[PDB]
Amino acid sequence: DVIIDQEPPLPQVRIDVDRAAAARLGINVADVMALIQTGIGGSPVTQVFV
Amino acid sequence: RLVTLCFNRRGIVALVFAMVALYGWYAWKQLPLEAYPDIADTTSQVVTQVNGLAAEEVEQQITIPLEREIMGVPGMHVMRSKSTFGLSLITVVFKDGAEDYWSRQRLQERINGVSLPYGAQPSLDPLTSPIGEIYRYTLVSKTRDLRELSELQFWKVIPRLKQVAGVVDVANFGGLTTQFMLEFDPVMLSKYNISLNQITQAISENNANAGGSILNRGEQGLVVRGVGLIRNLDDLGNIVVTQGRVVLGNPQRHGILGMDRNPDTIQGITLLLKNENPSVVMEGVHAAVRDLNDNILPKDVKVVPYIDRSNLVDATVHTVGKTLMEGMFLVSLVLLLFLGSPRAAIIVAVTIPLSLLMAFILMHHFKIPANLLSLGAIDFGIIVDGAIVVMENILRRRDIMQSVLQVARPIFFGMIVIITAYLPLFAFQRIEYKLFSPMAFAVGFALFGALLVALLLIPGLAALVWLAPRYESVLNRSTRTAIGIAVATLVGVMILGATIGRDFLPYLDEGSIWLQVTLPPGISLEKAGQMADNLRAATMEFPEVEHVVTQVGRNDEGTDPFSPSHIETAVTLHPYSTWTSGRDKQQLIEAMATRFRDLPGTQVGFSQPMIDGVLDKLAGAHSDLVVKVYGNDFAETRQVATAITRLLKTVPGAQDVIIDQEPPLPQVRIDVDRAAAARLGINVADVMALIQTGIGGSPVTQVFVEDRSYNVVARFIGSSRNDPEAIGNLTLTAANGAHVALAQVAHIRLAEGETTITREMNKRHLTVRLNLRGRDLSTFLEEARMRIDKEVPYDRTHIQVAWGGQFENQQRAQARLAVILPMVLALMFVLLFQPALILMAVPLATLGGLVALHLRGMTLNVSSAVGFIALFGVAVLNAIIMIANLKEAVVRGAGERMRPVLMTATVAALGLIPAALAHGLGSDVQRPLATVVVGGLITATALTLVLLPALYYLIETR
Amino acid sequence: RLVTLCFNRRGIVALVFAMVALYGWYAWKQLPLEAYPDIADTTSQVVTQVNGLAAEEVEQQITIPLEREIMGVPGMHVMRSKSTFGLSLITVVFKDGAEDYWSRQRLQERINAQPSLDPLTSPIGEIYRYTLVSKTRDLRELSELQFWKVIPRLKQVAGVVDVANFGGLTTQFMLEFDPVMLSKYNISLNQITQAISENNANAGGSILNRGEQGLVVRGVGLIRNLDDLGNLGRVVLGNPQRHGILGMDRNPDTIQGITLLLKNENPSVVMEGVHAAVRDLNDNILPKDVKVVPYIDRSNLVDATVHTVGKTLMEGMFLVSLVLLLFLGSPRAAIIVAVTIPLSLLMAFILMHHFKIPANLLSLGAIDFGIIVDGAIVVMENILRRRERDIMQSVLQVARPIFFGMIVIITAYLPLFAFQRIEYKLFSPMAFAVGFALFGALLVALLLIPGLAALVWLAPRYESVLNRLVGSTRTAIGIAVATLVGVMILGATIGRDFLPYLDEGSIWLQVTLPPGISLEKAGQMADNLRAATMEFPEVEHVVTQVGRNDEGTDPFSPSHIETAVTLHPYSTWTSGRDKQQLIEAMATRFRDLPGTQVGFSQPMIDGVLDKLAGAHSDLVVKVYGNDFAETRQVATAITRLLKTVPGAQDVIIDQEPPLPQVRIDVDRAAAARLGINVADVMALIQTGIGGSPVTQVFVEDRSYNVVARFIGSSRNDPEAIGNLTLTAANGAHVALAQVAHIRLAEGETTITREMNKRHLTVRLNLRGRDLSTFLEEARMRIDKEVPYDRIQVAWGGQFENQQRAQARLAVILPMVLALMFVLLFGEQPALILMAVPLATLGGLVALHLRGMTLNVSSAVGFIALFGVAVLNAIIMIANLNRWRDVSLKEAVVRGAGERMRPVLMTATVAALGLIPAALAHGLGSDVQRPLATVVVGGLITATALTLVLLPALYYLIET
Amino acid sequence: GQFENQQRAQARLAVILPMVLALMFVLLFGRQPALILMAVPLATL
Numbered sequence A: 001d002v003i004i005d006q007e008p009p010l011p012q013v014r015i016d017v018d019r020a021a022a023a024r025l026g027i028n029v030a031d032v033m034a035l036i037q038t039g040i041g042g043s044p045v046t047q048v049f050v
Numbered sequence B: 001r002l003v004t005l006c007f008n009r010r011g012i013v014a015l016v017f018a019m020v021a022l023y024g025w026y027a028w029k030q031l032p033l034e035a036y037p038d039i040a041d042t043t044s045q046v047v048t049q050v051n052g053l054a055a056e057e058v059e060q061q062i063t064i065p066l067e068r069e070i071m072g073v074p075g076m077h078v079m080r081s082k083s084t085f086g087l088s089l090i091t092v093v094f095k096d097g098a099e100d101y102w103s104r105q106r107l108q109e110r111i112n113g114v115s116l117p118y119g120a121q122p123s124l125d126p127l128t129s130p131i132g133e134i135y136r137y138t139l140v141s142k143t144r145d146l147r148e149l150s151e152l153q154f155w156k157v158i159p160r161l162k163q164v165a166g167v168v169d170v171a172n173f174g175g176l177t178t179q180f181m182l183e184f185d186p187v188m189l190s191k192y193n194i195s196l197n198q199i200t201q202a203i204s205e206n207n208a209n210a211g212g213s214i215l216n217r218g219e220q221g222l223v224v225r226g227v228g229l230i231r232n233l234d235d236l237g238n239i240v241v242t243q244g245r246v247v248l249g250n251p252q253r254h255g256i257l258g259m260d261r262n263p264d265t266i267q268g269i270t271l272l273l274k275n276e277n278p279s280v281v282m283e284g285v286h287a288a289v290r291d292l293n294d295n296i297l298p299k300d301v302k303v304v305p306y307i308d309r310s311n312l313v314d315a316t317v318h319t320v321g322k323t324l325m326e327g328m329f330l331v332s333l334v335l336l337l338f339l340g341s342p343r344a345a346i347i348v349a350v351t352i353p354l355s356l357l358m359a360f361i362l363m364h365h366f367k368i369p370a371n372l373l374s375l376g377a378i379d380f381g382i383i384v385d386g387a388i389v390v391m392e393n394i395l396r397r398r399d400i401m402q403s404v405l406q407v408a409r410p411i412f413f414g415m416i417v418i419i420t421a422y423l424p425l426f427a428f429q430r431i432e433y434k435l436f437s438p439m440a441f442a443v444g445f446a447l448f449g450a451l452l453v454a455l456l457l458i459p460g461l462a463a464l465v466w467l468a469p470r471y472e473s474v475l476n477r478s479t480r481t482a483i484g485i486a487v488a489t490l491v492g493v494m495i496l497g498a499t500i501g502r503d504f505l506p507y508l509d510e511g512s513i514w515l516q517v518t519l520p521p522g523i524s525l526e527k528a529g530q531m532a533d534n535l536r537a538a539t540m541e542f543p544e545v546e547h548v549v550t551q552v553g554r555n556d557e558g559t560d561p562f563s564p565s566h567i568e569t570a571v572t573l574h575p576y577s578t579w580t581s582g583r584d585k586q587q588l589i590e591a592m593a594t595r596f597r598d599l600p601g602t603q604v605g606f607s608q609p610m611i612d613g614v615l616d617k618l619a620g621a622h623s624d625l626v627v628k629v630y631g632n633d634f635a636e637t638r639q640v641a642t643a644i645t646r647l648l649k650t651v652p653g654a655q656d657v658i659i660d661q662e663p664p665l666p667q668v669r670i671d672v673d674r675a676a677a678a679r680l681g682i683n684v685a686d687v688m689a690l691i692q693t694g695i696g697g698s699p700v701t702q703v704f705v706e707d708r709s710y711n712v713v714a715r716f717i718g719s720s721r722n723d724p725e726a727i728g729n730l731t732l733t734a735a736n737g738a739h740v741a742l743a744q745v746a747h748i749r750l751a752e753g754e755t756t757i758t759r760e761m762n763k764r765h766l767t768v769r770l771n772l773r774g775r776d777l778s779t780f781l782e783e784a785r786m787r788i789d790k791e792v793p794y795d796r797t798h799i800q801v802a803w804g805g806q807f808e809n810q811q812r813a814q815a816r817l818a819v820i821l822p823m824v825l826a827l828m829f830v831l832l833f834q835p836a837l838i839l840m841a842v843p844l845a846t847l848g849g850l851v852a853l854h855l856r857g858m859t860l861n862v863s864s865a866v867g868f869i870a871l872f873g874v875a876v877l878n879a880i881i882m883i884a885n886l887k888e889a890v891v892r893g894a895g896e897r898m899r900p901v902l903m904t905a906t907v908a909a910l911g912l913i914p915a916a917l918a919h920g921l922g923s924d925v926q927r928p929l930a931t932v933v934v935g936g937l938i939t940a941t942a943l944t945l946v947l948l949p950a951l952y953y954l955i956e957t958r
Numbered sequence C: 001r002l003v004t005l006c007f008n009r010r011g012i013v014a015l016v017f018a019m020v021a022l023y024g025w026y027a028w029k030q031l032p033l034e035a036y037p038d039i040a041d042t043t044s045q046v047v048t049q050v051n052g053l054a055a056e057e058v059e060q061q062i063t064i065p066l067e068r069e070i071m072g073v074p075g076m077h078v079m080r081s082k083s084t085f086g087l088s089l090i091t092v093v094f095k096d097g098a099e100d101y102w103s104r105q106r107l108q109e110r111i112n113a114q115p116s117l118d119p120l121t122s123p124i125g126e127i128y129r130y131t132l133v134s135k136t137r138d139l140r141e142l143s144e145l146q147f148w149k150v151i152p153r154l155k156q157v158a159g160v161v162d163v164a165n166f167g168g169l170t171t172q173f174m175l176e177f178d179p180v181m182l183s184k185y186n187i188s189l190n191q192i193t194q195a196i197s198e199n200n201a202n203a204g205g206s207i208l209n210r211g212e213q214g215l216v217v218r219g220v221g222l223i224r225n226l227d228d229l230g231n232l233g234r235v236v237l238g239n240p241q242r243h244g245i246l247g248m249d250r251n252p253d254t255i256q257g258i259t260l261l262l263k264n265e266n267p268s269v270v271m272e273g274v275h276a277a278v279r280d281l282n283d284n285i286l287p288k289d290v291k292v293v294p295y296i297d298r299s300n301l302v303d304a305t306v307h308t309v310g311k312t313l314m315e316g317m318f319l320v321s322l323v324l325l326l327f328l329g330s331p332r333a334a335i336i337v338a339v340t341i342p343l344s345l346l347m348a349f350i351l352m353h354h355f356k357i358p359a360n361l362l363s364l365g366a367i368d369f370g371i372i373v374d375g376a377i378v379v380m381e382n383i384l385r386r387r388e389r390d391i392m393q394s395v396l397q398v399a400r401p402i403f404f405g406m407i408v409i410i411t412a413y414l415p416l417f418a419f420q421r422i423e424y425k426l427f428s429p430m431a432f433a434v435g436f437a438l439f440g441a442l443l444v445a446l447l448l449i450p451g452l453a454a455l456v457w458l459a460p461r462y463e464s465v466l467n468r469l470v471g472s473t474r475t476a477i478g479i480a481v482a483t484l485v486g487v488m489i490l491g492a493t494i495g496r497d498f499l500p501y502l503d504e505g506s507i508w509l510q511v512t513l514p515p516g517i518s519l520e521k522a523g524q525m526a527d528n529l530r531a532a533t534m535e536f537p538e539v540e541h542v543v544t545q546v547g548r549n550d551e552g553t554d555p556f557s558p559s560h561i562e563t564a565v566t567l568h569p570y571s572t573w574t575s576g577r578d579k580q581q582l583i584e585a586m587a588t589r590f591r592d593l594p595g596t597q598v599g600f601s602q603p604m605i606d607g608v609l610d611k612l613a614g615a616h617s618d619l620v621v622k623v624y625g626n627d628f629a630e631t632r633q634v635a636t637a638i639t640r641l642l643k644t645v646p647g648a649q650d651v652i653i654d655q656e657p658p659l660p661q662v663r664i665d666v667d668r669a670a671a672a673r674l675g676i677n678v679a680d681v682m683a684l685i686q687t688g689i690g691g692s693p694v695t696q697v698f699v700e701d702r703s704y705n706v707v708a709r710f711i712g713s714s715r716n717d718p719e720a721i722g723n724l725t726l727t728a729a730n731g732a733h734v735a736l737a738q739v740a741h742i743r744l745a746e747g748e749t750t751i752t753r754e755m756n757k758r759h760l761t762v763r764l765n766l767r768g769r770d771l772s773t774f775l776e777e778a779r780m781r782i783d784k785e786v787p788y789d790r791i792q793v794a795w796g797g798q799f800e801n802q803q804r805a806q807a808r809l810a811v812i813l814p815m816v817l818a819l820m821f822v823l824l825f826g827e828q829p830a831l832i833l834m835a836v837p838l839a840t841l842g843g844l845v846a847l848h849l850r851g852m853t854l855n856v857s858s859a860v861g862f863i864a865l866f867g868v869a870v871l872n873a874i875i876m877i878a879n880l881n882r883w884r885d886v887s888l889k890e891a892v893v894r895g896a897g898e899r900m901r902p903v904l905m906t907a908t909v910a911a912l913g914l915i916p917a918a919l920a921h922g923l924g925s926d927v928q929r930p931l932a933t934v935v936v937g938g939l940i941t942a943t944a945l946t947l948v949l950l951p952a953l954y955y956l957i958e959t
Numbered sequence D: 001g002q003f004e005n006q007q008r009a010q011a012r013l014a015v016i017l018p019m020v021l022a023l024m025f026v027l028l029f030g031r032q033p034a035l036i037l038m039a040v041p042l043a044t045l
């Protein structure tokens, strides 16, 4: 048996942030990262107990 | 016993003895080489590295919480701490018998779970000994700059060296770390309404990538990436908070490292992991360095060491080897001259090397270091003695198993008594154990070996004309005058013994010299740099110095509390057999000391690297002796210590004397007016933020580049915080939202404060360092300790002037020494069970050692004590043999036994003769054993064949 | 064998024995003193402390998952846990052999809420209890003295792991809000606290240069005093709601410390350094008329123990020598055979010095001495009588029965290493000491001794009864067989325990009070309790610890008290009252203080009782089940039942009843229609009502919490709470009772989970009667109830101790008789083996004599008795069988009739060395008296059957 | 992979086999011991 262990490069949808734009638009890249991590990604907010 | 049957096993027993010898050599191969044993005890420091704070704010908020939460760790022996410019440094040293990792465990149990205000993270120092600094180097380059060299240091060199097993960490000094500096002009700060903290909590934000997990398309799942990470400075300059300068930079410098005409360079210190073997690791760091210079580093940038432990290792191997070689050579030569026959001479000679392998194998299989210092002091001429008698019988008998079985019993007896006296060397612990125990081990093992060889192989191996009857005359040559000479010479040993020095270490010369250089208080890094430069100028004038390196200030780790006013100087030398000059060693130190007294503002203390380390970890400060001045008030203790400093400076024994703690430095103290800020709507927090960030310059966030990381820092612009007026001009933002200069709500003044606070078990003191050079410890401490505690103005807040250094060290050492020494007497008295006179044949050698010591102006240190142990061990065998062979009975043995007695007294006091020669690194410890043993043996032998037989005819007949 | 070279080695063996003498004295001078062996097992507890929080938001999510992960720690044996207001504390006890730091490390690993580890100390580590006394100083001043002087000092004593404070007053800075001026001001408690907290910092500006100088910049904003705080309501000094209260002789409110002996360190040794510390405090540090004065001091117990053991060993010594003197007639021989005792002792210390074996005074007191010389006195008897030139011609006659007899007493003394835990820790140094000293007795009697060179009527009386043995086969074997069952049904009626009372210096109390009681009322009840305890002439001091302390290693409420009762020296007891009778006078008295339920124990043993079973009592009954109400019901049953049994003295339910709590739930939809967060409410309760500390002001090396909380009578009752206001989203005040159900609801006070089972504990003491018969009766009466099931019920405490001890006895017994018969093989052996019941008779009639039971101590006693008894049997049968091998019947009076003196002599010295150990008068004799009784009684009725039934046995069997 | 241990094991056998082939040489002591020691290859066949 013979195979390359590492899986080949997979596609990603990459959301880079244009600095100069959000600058000339008055926006923080933190806002975007929260948009992704929470809005797109979906981080847990708190812990419910039963 | 087995002497009977071993004879018929000649071939067989020879064969195994070859095989054993093989395993002998093999055992020597896998044997750890120590040129300088781990003298240090088991210690551990805890480091709290607050960035930008001053002493009063560091002692009360960290050193007090830590000491509160530490003092009861299972293992403590001494506990000290130093609080300084943004550093709580708590040194703990454990009792003798505590394992390192165990101790670090208990400690680390007690240090965590705390709560340190300014985000302070109490970590632990790397697991290493004072003598662990094994490889000091520097990055050289004609073309590249210090920033680039620093980058190489941080991202390639130190990492690579860290890959070497046995290397616990690599300590950096000098160079320039790179910050992303952001210069805020405070004018447009309280103009756009929002102030510092708004920025530093905004620019801290927009630099944290986002992961969006998996997004599905068809049968594929693409992970989502949000790249919101501040990269280059242009990604930085374009950041907004509402609708200033941006440059590469460096934090204010902890230290500056200098060298031969090189003011600003960079060094690494390779920290050996505790217990791991120096040379073994050294191979690794060597390969690593070569790999760096030849492959990793850019060509034109070379790693160049200036202190390497393997140098001392080579010097030691050379010297010790030379000693053993000359020893065995001289022993074989005297064997030739005293036997005549080369065959028998060689027969007895091979008892030496064979036994070594028999000693090695026992040390190897049961975990004993091949300590070179406690090996060069081996005698050889003591080993062969058993075999020698087995010869002296047989050769002077012309079967042979009968004479060998005859002399066997008086040899097993002699074996014990000589292998017994060495047993007390196992008593003393601490730093006098790691240095002399392997010697006694190797001797006992080589005595098991010597015995086995003499009784189970030696038999199987099958101008004096004026010296003979001259002795037969003096034998004939009065009981009152005899005991008169006996007692008188005895009081000779008592008087000459009572009048002698009492050191602890015979210096122990390393390759180089270490300096504790002390500059004026509260000076700038620049000025300190100038001064250090001039000191190196002054040092390089002497031709004996190879390289001179200065460390002003402190390394970036925090394992040293040092201010810019403090320098540590490494001074390397040329080989001693290469100096085109006439200077000695202490003469070189004295010369440098004279030259260094000619420079203004520079006080200089002399020591050596490893020993500076262990002296520090022992006393609490870097000097041979220290005088602690306990007290809760600083001014008082400083006054007392002033008196004690002048007082100790007085005595013609203390070569260096100075207070260890820097004076109260000045400081611009910005107090905050409470009632005013209240009457004006201002928060203390805002002021603190302005100071910490706008003046101090705290790093906002951190930027990544490849595998590298840098700190984005924001701070008020250049020419804005230059002086108290300017600082007072800086503004905040009230509830009115405009401008209020801190000069309206804060009292900004020039006060003074303590530089370092040396808390001692919650009993604050002030160290008074003192190095001695010339006078011993007893003659010195007599006058010193006499004068001091009787000239000091009691009492008030504490003020109990105590001592430290090799003081209690020597005290406990000698204490245990004289605890176990009389115990071995009765042990070697029941053995001799008549025993009274043989036991009384001991102080004969004493005066013999005393005359040679007095001759060479030495002292009664632990080394020479061991010398008297070997001496007392062997000098009794001659009595035993001149008694077993022995009113006219004197000539029944004396005239007969006179020949091997001299032969044993020649070979023993001739193996240590080349070990009585100075020069070369690695002889400093072994010499005082030689001075005792040889000189002792000469007189004690010259007397044992005179007063002892004249004492054997005065028994049970009077 | 080796007597040959020794006879010509007199001077040499003498000198070397002098050497072992010196090294023996030195060995004893380097041996640890243990008066009360670390009985405890390897245990450690984790403390998850949440300040001010109640008892269900502390167990639901804290104790449970922690119990899940921690249950899997290696070496775990028993896992208990308790959850309540303030905290969740989880106790873990490990298996034996589990090293401390190792275990604590595994625990610490697994627990990685803020769960911490308790100090590393044994339940008997509390070695020095004290109180700060003064006449002029106030409790706050004494509190600061405690906190910043005394404890920081005693913490320096090496071997002191920690010091536990109880009482006094921690000092804090606090503003007393009046929400009236919080109404239309729109600033919340959270903005108030974030503001008042964030402006407490001292920034540094690093280095600012000025020419050649470089000056550090110091910004100072650290708050220093309430003056700097004042820049509304009353801002003053104050103290947090009181932990517990500690009381003493008429003093209701003082302050105490508990010095905790670090695990596995020598108590007296550390007590030295503690004494140095305390002394230093009184002499030079503390203000005058402020003295740290102890009320419990382990040193006292060590004193009384070394006095008791010293007196015992001395009396035994002089009695044995009295026997030797009376017997041999020659004081010379008496002395030369007596000097085996000190020789062996010195020769046993060395072996304990190098094996690092401690010097248990409790077990060294139980050395027979007269059982050591039996290896030597038989030789002397065989020389100074039988022989009447060549000494070692006579020492060879009785040599074999001596080497083999003594290796038999050694192989018999051997299997004490079988049992583990407490019954091992108690009786282990004795086994070794006796072993080594026995081998020393062997090495002396046949070595150094050869180098050394009314009975009238007792003589022929013996000859007469021996002539009665001529015949009477069925009568002799009649006596034998009849007395066999005659003792088999005498030890069948004997009571069984696990160990005697073991008297310490004092008496400990687990005093239980009515539920929900305030700290003031609790304090008064304790005041009364203590005033009734002082109504006795024998009580030196009485200390109450009502409520909780500072650390949190106890989950106690004001309804809980632990009391320490110190006594006068028994020597000075004017009132004719036994200690047990003092205890029952105390119990009766306490059954006349209203609401005051009192558990009886001791300060050291109570701890190990608790760590072992669960609660602080000798016995417990655990009623398991996941339902609070029902388990408590069944527990009510078991309580009412057990408290009727004549053996059970105190009986209670360890878990306190549910209590009312004024409970504030939040109305979701209400605050959804008023725009309010539940967090605003919780802030109001935690900061405003609860009074959470906001920041931390520093003064010198001291520090204090700055707290913000509403003033008193603003949180007075549920109405007042509900009536104070909090702003909303519309920028206007809103009353609390508008969005939150403030009511009164009953909740649980304490939840105890053991082995992942909710249980309630019926704790009870065995005092009054027996253990075997008692537990038999009560446990039998338990099976009546147990209304299943929805619930399991178990017994615990010294019940398990009894079980393990008994099982170990049954394991050990046949193990020794194997080797014992094996050694007795060749040099038929069953004849000699059956000498054990002969000794068993006296060993059991003596227990009934003074009024005792059958504890592990007395068991070991029988293990000892068997040795000397079988030694006498061996000597008899050997000298008999060798003398001879009717003409054979003549040997029964010849080879046996002349063994009268050796046997009697041995059986006397071995039975008079333990007579002083059969004395009780003193602390430290409360474990020796069992072995003493068993041996002394079982040897004075064993010899009479060794010299009568035994020769007849030999004559009857060999034909 | 397994070749690290392959080499380790095999080389180890290449180390500690004369460890005994010299030990048995000496042990066997009735010249002739060589003859008795040649029993090894015959078995190896």
Ligand SMILES: [Zn+2]
Pocket (backbone or CB within 6 Å): B613
């Ligand atoms: Zn250093």
